[PDB]
Amino acid sequence: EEKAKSIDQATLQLLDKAKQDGVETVWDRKADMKVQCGFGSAGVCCRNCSMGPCRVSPVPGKGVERGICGATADVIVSRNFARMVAAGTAAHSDHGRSIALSLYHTSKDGDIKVKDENKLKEVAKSFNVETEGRDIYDIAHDVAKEGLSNYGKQLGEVTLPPSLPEKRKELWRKLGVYPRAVDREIAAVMHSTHIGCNADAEAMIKMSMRCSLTDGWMGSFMGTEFSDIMFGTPHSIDTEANLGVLEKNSVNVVLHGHEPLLSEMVVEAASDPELVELAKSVGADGINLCGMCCTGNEVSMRHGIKIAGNFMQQELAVVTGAVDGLIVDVQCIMPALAKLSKSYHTKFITTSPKAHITDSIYMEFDEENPLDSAKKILKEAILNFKNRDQSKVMIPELKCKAILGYSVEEIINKLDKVVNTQIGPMQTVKPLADVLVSGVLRGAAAVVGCNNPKVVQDSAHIETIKGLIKNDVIVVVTGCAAQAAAKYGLLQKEAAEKYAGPGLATVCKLVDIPPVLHMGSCVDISRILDLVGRVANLLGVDMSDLPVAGVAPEWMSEKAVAIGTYVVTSGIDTWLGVAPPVTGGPEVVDILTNKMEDWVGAKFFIETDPHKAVEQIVNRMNEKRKKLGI
Amino acid sequence: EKAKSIDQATLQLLDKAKQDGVETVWDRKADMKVQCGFGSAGVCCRNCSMGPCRVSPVPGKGVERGICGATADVIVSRNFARMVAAGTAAHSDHGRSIALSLYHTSKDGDIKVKDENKLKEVAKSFNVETEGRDIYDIAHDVAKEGLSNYGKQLGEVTLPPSLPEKRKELWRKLGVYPRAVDREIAAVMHSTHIGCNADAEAMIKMSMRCSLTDGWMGSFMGTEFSDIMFGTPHSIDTEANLGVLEKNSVNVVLHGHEPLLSEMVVEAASDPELVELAKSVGADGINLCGMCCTGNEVSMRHGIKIAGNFMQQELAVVTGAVDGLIVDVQCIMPALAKLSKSYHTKFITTSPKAHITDSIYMEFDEENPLDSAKKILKEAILNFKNRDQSKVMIPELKCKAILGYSVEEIINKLDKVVNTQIGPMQTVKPLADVLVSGVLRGAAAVVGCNNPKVVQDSAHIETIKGLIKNDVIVVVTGCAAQAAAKYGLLQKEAAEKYAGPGLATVCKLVDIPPVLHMGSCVDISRILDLVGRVANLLGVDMSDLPVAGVAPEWMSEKAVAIGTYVVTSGIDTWLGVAPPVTGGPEVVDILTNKMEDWVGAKFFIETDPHKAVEQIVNRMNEKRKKLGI
Numbered sequence A: 001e002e003k004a005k006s007i008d009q010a011t012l013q014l015l016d017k018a019k020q021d022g023v024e025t026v027w028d029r030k031a032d033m034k035v036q037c038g039f040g041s042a043g044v045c046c047r048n049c050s051m052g053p054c055r056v057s058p059v060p061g062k063g064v065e066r067g068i069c070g071a072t073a074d075v076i077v078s079r080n081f082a083r084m085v086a087a088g089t090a091a092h093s094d095h096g097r098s099i100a101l102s103l104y105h106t107s108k109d110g111d112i113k114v115k116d117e118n119k120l121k122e123v124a125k126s127f128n129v130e131t132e133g134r135d136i137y138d139i140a141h142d143v144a145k146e147g148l149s150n151y152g153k154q155l156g157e158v159t160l161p162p163s164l165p166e167k168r169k170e171l172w173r174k175l176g177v178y179p180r181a182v183d184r185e186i187a188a189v190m191h192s193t194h195i196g197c198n199a200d201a202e203a204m205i206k207m208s209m210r211c212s213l214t215d216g217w218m219g220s221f222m223g224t225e226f227s228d229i230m231f232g233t234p235h236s237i238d239t240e241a242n243l244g245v246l247e248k249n250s251v252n253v254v255l256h257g258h259e260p261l262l263s264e265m266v267v268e269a270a271s272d273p274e275l276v277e278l279a280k281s282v283g284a285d286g287i288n289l290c291g292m293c294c295t296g297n298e299v300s301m302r303h304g305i306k307i308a309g310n311f312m313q314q315e316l317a318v319v320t321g322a323v324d325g326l327i328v329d330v331q332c333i334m335p336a337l338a339k340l341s342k343s344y345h346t347k348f349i350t351t352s353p354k355a356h357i358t359d360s361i362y363m364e365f366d367e368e369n370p371l372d373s374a375k376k377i378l379k380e381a382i383l384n385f386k387n388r389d390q391s392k393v394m395i396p397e398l399k400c401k402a403i404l405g406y407s408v409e410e411i412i413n414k415l416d417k418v419v420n421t422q423i424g425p426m427q428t429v430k431p432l433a434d435v436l437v438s439g440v441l442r443g444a445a446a447v448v449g450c451n452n453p454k455v456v457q458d459s460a461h462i463e464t465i466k467g468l469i470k471n472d473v474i475v476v477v478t479g480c481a482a483q484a485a486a487k488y489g490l491l492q493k494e495a496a497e498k499y500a501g502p503g504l505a506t507v508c509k510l511v512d513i514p515p516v517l518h519m520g521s522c523v524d525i526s527r528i529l530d531l532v533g534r535v536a537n538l539l540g541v542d543m544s545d546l547p548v549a550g551v552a553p554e555w556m557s558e559k560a561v562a563i564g565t566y567v568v569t570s571g572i573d574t575w576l577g578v579a580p581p582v583t584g585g586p587e588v589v590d591i592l593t594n595k596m597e598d599w600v601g602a603k604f605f606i607e608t609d610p611h612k613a614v615e616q617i618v619n620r621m622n623e624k625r626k627k628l629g630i
Numbered sequence B: 001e002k003a004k005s006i007d008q009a010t011l012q013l014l015d016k017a018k019q020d021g022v023e024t025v026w027d028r029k030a031d032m033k034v035q036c037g038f039g040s041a042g043v044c045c046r047n048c049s050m051g052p053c054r055v056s057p058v059p060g061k062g063v064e065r066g067i068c069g070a071t072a073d074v075i076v077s078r079n080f081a082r083m084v085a086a087g088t089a090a091h092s093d094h095g096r097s098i099a100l101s102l103y104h105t106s107k108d109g110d111i112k113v114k115d116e117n118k119l120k121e122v123a124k125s126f127n128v129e130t131e132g133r134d135i136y137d138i139a140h141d142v143a144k145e146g147l148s149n150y151g152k153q154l155g156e157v158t159l160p161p162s163l164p165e166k167r168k169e170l171w172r173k174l175g176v177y178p179r180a181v182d183r184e185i186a187a188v189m190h191s192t193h194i195g196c197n198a199d200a201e202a203m204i205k206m207s208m209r210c211s212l213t214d215g216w217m218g219s220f221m222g223t224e225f226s227d228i229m230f231g232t233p234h235s236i237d238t239e240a241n242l243g244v245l246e247k248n249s250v251n252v253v254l255h256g257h258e259p260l261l262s263e264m265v266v267e268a269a270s271d272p273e274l275v276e277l278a279k280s281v282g283a284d285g286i287n288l289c290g291m292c293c294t295g296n297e298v299s300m301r302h303g304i305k306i307a308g309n310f311m312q313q314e315l316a317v318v319t320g321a322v323d324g325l326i327v328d329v330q331c332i333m334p335a336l337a338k339l340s341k342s343y344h345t346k347f348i349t350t351s352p353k354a355h356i357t358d359s360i361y362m363e364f365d366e367e368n369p370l371d372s373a374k375k376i377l378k379e380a381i382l383n384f385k386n387r388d389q390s391k392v393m394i395p396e397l398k399c400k401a402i403l404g405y406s407v408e409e410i411i412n413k414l415d416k417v418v419n420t421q422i423g424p425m426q427t428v429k430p431l432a433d434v435l436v437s438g439v440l441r442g443a444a445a446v447v448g449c450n451n452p453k454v455v456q457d458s459a460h461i462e463t464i465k466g467l468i469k470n471d472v473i474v475v476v477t478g479c480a481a482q483a484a485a486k487y488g489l490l491q492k493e494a495a496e497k498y499a500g501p502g503l504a505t506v507c508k509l510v511d512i513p514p515v516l517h518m519g520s521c522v523d524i525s526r527i528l529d530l531v532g533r534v535a536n537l538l539g540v541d542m543s544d545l546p547v548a549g550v551a552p553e554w555m556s557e558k559a560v561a562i563g564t565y566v567v568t569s570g571i572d573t574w575l576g577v578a579p580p581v582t583g584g585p586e587v588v589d590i591l592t593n594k595m596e597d598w599v600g601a602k603f604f605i606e607t608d609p610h611k612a613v614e615q616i617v618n619r620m621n622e623k624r625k626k627l628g629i
């Protein structure tokens, strides 16, 4: 009768417990919202000044046509869209900015240090920083200074990655969307969306495209590249996923958020002899560290830390009654966790001055003394195990194995296994390019995205991934979408025979990989751009000429909008499972889902049905294959 | 039905607009009927696709939290902070463009260093050497240091000297000291994103830190660098209101905010070739008029007649005499594109930052600025040939006004009341003297745009008139200054007609009107400078002086950023239009109560201007008693 809440049995079990406990969840608050405002849902409501609030008609020819200022529905909708990109870009901007500042404070006998010297030497080449006969920390600081300039330089040209084809750069230049400093483009969009500024849908949407580029090729890239320098480049690693990872007799410390420095220090803190003994003093087996959302992906990729769950599972993790400490930093942390943690012994600890949540324990993460600060927070979670009500604990016995760490460096290393020593070249993406041109693999898709109560949890993610791998399309995943697959069991070597098509199953067996490749967090989507870029450069074509696609089956965050925008602007078609608020703007719908193709060689596709989406992705990929002659 | 405006010229053309069958901002306001109450109270959130969400502004009843679990106070505080971030961004790009122009100055170039003295003083603030060096070498170094304040990630930002050290340490202690301009905008846009900040007090403090990068930096730099290249304003005469348009002349109206284009269109209007072209088409000459901030910037430095303010822009086209309406960015109603189709007027858009569909687009080349301005102005001149003199109607109503009261000019004027054998010269001591003596009960700043929720110019005039009667010297900027220019308060004659005993006496001695026009809103930085200078001269903080700010009819997000930095700077601010904060009880308490305990000043929302004037006078007397003056 009522639509299912989720496809995961562990999620469905804890949802029943939440009802019996009397607590409210995101699914319950969705029902409370009832019918959602159509004006806001169509994007035709404007609040960019105090002359309104204005609400024009989404159906042209009837109702109120213009806003008080004169803005038409297309103007209102295009500005509303722009601001989402600018907000999404800002979330990834501060993320990478913080990583770069950490790189600037690295020392040989310090809490934060350079782990991957080889990666730093390569990154230093792109930023024009010398490496010959110099201290790795002196290079790291000069690189950090050059990287930080990309955020607010007002003169000169910005440094872009080598994987970005020159054809794509020239296309942006001629279109007028070449990126500038990161914070500069955010201000540019915010200024033009102000009352009495831009009133042209095409120009506004182009401003968002320019802004979104500073996220994917600058904010996220540097965030990913510098994280690999300081914490290590990820490689194929095993781990367990789903809420079944929590242990009843151990202290459970769940890390949620996005910033990787705090989670890297809580991992090291879990290995301090004093803290391991304090856990035993309280009556625990040990310290069971778990992750959720990006911060969890960033730790499972590098240290194989177990994943508790994705975005909409964050409330149900507390409902298990086994989370002693829930340490959060920034982004995608539902404020409900403060009210929910009151009904349990769980301690909700906020650490970033960027994300303060009312009625929550606030323990600021001292970046000057990071390891000491991490130990102080972890100690509080350990001591809280004393207040655990073991009789009311209920951790569903449902976990799944998964393989991740599939960075571009790791994928290239694995592809070397299928290269002949006497013929083929080494450490290049050629094996992947060869399989795509031949036609063994119909194409390569990137399923990324969040969880939305408008879609059954994980339903569209699994249906979409399944359908693509069945049609010989290798799938790469990141963020909550990657976790959704890890929970189902698609991130396993044995998933190739079970779900992959004829060609993909052959490639999986030869290269020895699962049919779905976990490439990391949403910031790690820059690795997908890097991979697709290398394939394009190796074949001497632009990214728009390859049979590639991006999918966001379930998405909410303004970050997903910026991600989609920079993916389409980079030349990769993107399918959206959740419809953005553009319905009321006919010109905006035409631009996003049609005219855009003429500007960047790619377009948006809105499809809520995942079965129809895979049909469209395959047909579109084939169209691009026929044009290229492959 | 309520009156649409108090100005007779405006009411006359509103009748013509009806007869011509054209739409105006007032018509579209009526069409919006009962505007939404969730958006009005600020309890509607669209920061993620899980929404839209709408909680109840009335605690206890209706939906309590959003889908993510965000309470009303969070939703309201995030919505308020985004208004500040947007307002700050608008001024940021304005000043940034000015700093880039300062970096491209040349001895034999279109953009030059007109005020060398000001640049030398500004160089001291940025720690740039000014001894035995080319003025353009100093200008480029000052421009580079100014540009750093927009995106420096390491080190501290440079703030102007007028800012008291007490105020700086107070911001530091509160955690709202300013970082780079664009960096702070990113910080607000980030913390407002789903799953980030969910504390009203923290969010409102983040917005205050962001707003400070607008007043003491972008707006301050924008004003300072503009005075260097285009000249520092001094007392000048001009005429205001739509009566300034001439039926037998080429009427070129400059609307917008950017000053470089306007400055170049003025220089272009003197090109012999363009002067003769105006004669070839059969005109008396080139009648240059301005509107909104851009019109203020040109009227402050060149006395260019002011056609009107924000809600009069459509009515300027309705006269049927505007041959060319050249625009750039900020507050250029998009309605002008459709409205211009009913008349011969050529609506020209010149900025890639503000493209408007169905408008003639002539990009203003910043590499060849004078040649670019000449090419745009030529199109406006040639359009005179397409005028239909039978459908023209310019109200025979204009007003004389005096403006150009920069801090330098106010000080220069105050030196005439200083004995050659006692007080120092070029200081604000005479103004602090009258304020401490009690002759001037205080000093209020009336700034702001125009909103259909309020009768056009009604609150501006009633507030200004009421403050000057109660011996409170009034300083004005933007549409509020233009409103006063049209009424006739920016005249020396207005002191005897509308000012109190003390203020009328001071006006007679200093030889000034009772209301001083200090420029555009980027020129509100002059108000901060002036108040800051008085605070430093008296060895106190800005929150200790009997000063206040008023926004009787605001609407722009810039106005929210202005108000926020004015309160954060220590000056109490009154709002004539209620912002979208009603639905957040904690947010209301923070802005209108706890803020006083954080920065020594708070917000006051009052729609009735007569009540607002009483509240301002009482609050000033309260601060005077605490100081013993």
Ligand code: SF4
Residues within 6 Å of the ligand: A037, A038, A039, A040, A041, A045, A046, A053, A055, B036, B037, B038, B039, B040, B044, B045, B052, B054
């Ligand atoms: S503010 Fe807009 S989106 Fe929100 S409830 Fe009102 S009309 Fe709908």
Ligand code: SF4
Residues within 6 Å of the ligand: A046, A047, A048, A049, A050, A051, A052, A053, A054, A067, A068, A069, A070, A071, A076, A194, A195, A196
């Ligand atoms: S900018 Fe225009 S559409 Fe938006 S609230 Fe203001 S008058 Fe209405």
Ligand code: SF4
Residues within 6 Å of the ligand: B045, B046, B047, B048, B049, B050, B051, B052, B053, B065, B066, B067, B068, B069, B070, B194
């Ligand atoms: S921020 Fe919260 S209340 Fe707003 S749309 Fe998102 S989930 Fe809903």
Ligand SMILES: [Ca+2]
Residues within 6 Å of the ligand: A126, A159, A160, A161, A221, A222, A225
């Ligand atoms: Ca890079």
Ligand SMILES: [Ca+2]
Residues within 6 Å of the ligand: A236, A237, A238, A403
């Ligand atoms: Ca393995």
Ligand SMILES: [Ca+2]
Residues within 6 Å of the ligand: A363, A364, A365, A366, A373, A374, A376, A377
């Ligand atoms: Ca701490």
Ligand SMILES: [Ca+2]
Residues within 6 Å of the ligand: B121, B122, B125, B160, B161, B224
């Ligand atoms: Ca100065």
Ligand SMILES: [Cl-]
Residues within 6 Å of the ligand: A427, A428, A429, A430, A534, A535, A538
């Ligand atoms: Cl390669």
Ligand SMILES: [Cl-]
Residues within 6 Å of the ligand: B004, B014, B015
């Ligand atoms: Cl009327």
Ligand SMILES: [Cl-]
Residues within 6 Å of the ligand: B021, B022, B023, B338, B339, B342
């Ligand atoms: Cl019209």
Ligand SMILES: [Cl-]
Residues within 6 Å of the ligand: B320, B321, B343, B344, B345, B387, B388, B389, B391, B392
């Ligand atoms: Cl006409």
Ligand SMILES: [Cl-]
Residues within 6 Å of the ligand: B426, B427, B428, B429, B533, B537
């Ligand atoms: Cl002084």
Ligand SMILES: [Cl-]
Residues within 6 Å of the ligand: none
């Ligand atoms: Cl009157």
